[PDB]
A paper describes a structure:
Secretagogin is built by three domains (denoted here as A, B and C), each comprising a pair of EF-hand motifs. Here, we identify secretagogin as a molecular switch between syntaxin-4, a protein facilitating the movement of reserve vesicles toward the active zone, and SNAP-25, a core member of the vesicle fusion complex.
Thus, recombinant human secretagogin together with the GFP-fused SNAP25-derived peptide could also be used in X-ray crystallization aimed at resolving the structure of ligand-bound human secretagogin. We determined the X-ray structure of both mouse and human secretagogin bound to the SNAP-25-derived peptide ligand at 2.35 Å and 2.30 Å resolution, respectively. In both cases, GFP carrying the target peptide (155-GIIGNLRHMALDMGNEIDTQNRQID-179) as C-terminal tag was employed whereby the large globular GFP module served as a crystallization chaperon that was necessary to obtain diffracting crystals. The P212121 crystal’s asymmetric unit contained two copies of the protein complex, wherein the secretagogin molecules were identical; superposition results in a Cα-rmsd of 0.54 Å and 0.66 Å for the mouse and the human proteins, respectively. Even for GFP-mediated crystal contacts, its interaction with the SNAP-25c fragment was limited to 1 and 2 hydrogen bonds for mouse and human structures, respectively, making the target peptide freely available to secretagogin. The electron density map allowed us to model a 17 AA-residue (155-GIIGNLRHMALDMGNEI-171) and a 16 AA-residue (155-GIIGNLRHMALDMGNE-170) section of the SNAP-25 peptide for the mouse and human secretagogin complexes, respectively. Contact points between secretagogin and the SNAP-25-peptide were dominated by hydrophobic interactions (155-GIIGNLRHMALDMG NEI-171, polar interaction/hydrophobic-stacking).
Numbering used by the authors:
A (entry chain A): 2 to 64, 68 to 247
B (entry chain D): 12 to 69, 78 to 276
Write the structure that this text describes.
Amino acid sequence: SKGEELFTGVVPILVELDGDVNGHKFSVSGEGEGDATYGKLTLKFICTTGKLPVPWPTLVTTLVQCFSRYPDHMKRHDFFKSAMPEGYVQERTIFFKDDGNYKTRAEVKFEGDTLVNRIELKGIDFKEDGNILGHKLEYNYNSHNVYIMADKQKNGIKVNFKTRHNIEDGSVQLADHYQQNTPIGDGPVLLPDNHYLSTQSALSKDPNEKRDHMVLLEFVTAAGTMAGIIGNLRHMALDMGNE
Amino acid sequence: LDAAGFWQVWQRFDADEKGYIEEKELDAFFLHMLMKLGTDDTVMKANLHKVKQQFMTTIRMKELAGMFLSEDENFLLLFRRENPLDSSVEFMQIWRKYDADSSGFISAAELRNFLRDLFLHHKKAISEAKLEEYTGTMMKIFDRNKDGRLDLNDLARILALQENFLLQFKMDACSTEERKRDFEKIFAYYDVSKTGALEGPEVDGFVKDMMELVQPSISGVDLDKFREILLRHCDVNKDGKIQKSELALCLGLKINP
Ligand SMILES: [Ca+2]
Ligand SMILES: [Ca+2]
Ligand SMILES: [Ca+2]
Ligand SMILES: [Ca+2]
């Protein structure tokens, strides 16, 4: 795809979220850069409305998968870059087990030289002393697989995965994501074979930032797809030769 | 001048078998060659001149071979160079044939047998003495570590074996139709006998080509070792052969034939 060449090197990123969770309104602004050749993201977010009424870790998946590394042999499966620069719509429902849910709508696109992710989020049915509104999540993040299937009728992809959020009493809070992506433009896109993205992320704080904020580093690579026959041959050859 | 002496001279300019030399190597080639025939400083410039002329009047190995070698020693260096072996299966049928003791290496005595049959095949009677001399020259030319036997790759160079057939296939040809097309191309290539299963030398050739994707050229003993391992991996009915359906399933083919 032509969209792929937009991500050659280092690309600046902006993020805006307007949120409402059980009536608590908040806004988040993010900035940073993406380096898709290394599956590399570096992002800082700040709550601009004061304190955030939900844990930062609950907002990580909501707050730019066009930055995933796609190995050369899986390039024909990279939907996210193919919709660029006109971008795509990313819609989700995130069901937190034994608690409420997020409903999000984002447009991800280039605005001049910058990849911009604009989100609106609504949260309902949260228990006022549950893990989210009680702030009982640990400030950290686990590694996941994000499963991607083509949705030919919608000219897009359907995406499903579960995130695991550590609780401070030692338990885990599951969040079950139902995701759809749709191109904004009329241009051609790449519909993938079934695969997944493998993610890893670390959370930190900027010591010189007085506002409620999160620093996020993430690595993301695609996998799971059949390569050419030579791929199977090469990997079998490797194993036959051990010992 | 024997093939080995010509070969040693050819080595200075074409050590990795491009098959040719270049036009300002040429003079240094004749020089060095002419030096090799034990030639006097007094006759050098003329012989060089005449030689250059003859050639000009007639830069690949065949051309320099015809000038300085007998027709039997040209044959030794070029019998396959004009007719390179296209199939690794045929190659391993030859290997198995001449490695009659299954030692994993072609000894001097096995090379002599190879050459005896070779000459008879091209309807050429040579004396027993030249048979011996040629075996020694061929050995000297192709015995890389001078240990006195020929390895798998050494016979491959003697037969001018073409590139590994498997190397044409690419990672990004990942569609189901792409993988099916390439799988069929592969199995057509190895199943020379058209039986629907790889047997004997068809397995051999496949094992050689598969392992050499990820390892330096393999030895005769390693081949037999990897053949067993591959069979223990993919031989579902345990009949010592690789049915198409077994190779397909072991290479991830979506629809089993
Ligand atoms: Ca032997
Ligand atoms: Ca040797
Ligand atoms: Ca067969
Ligand atoms: Ca079998």
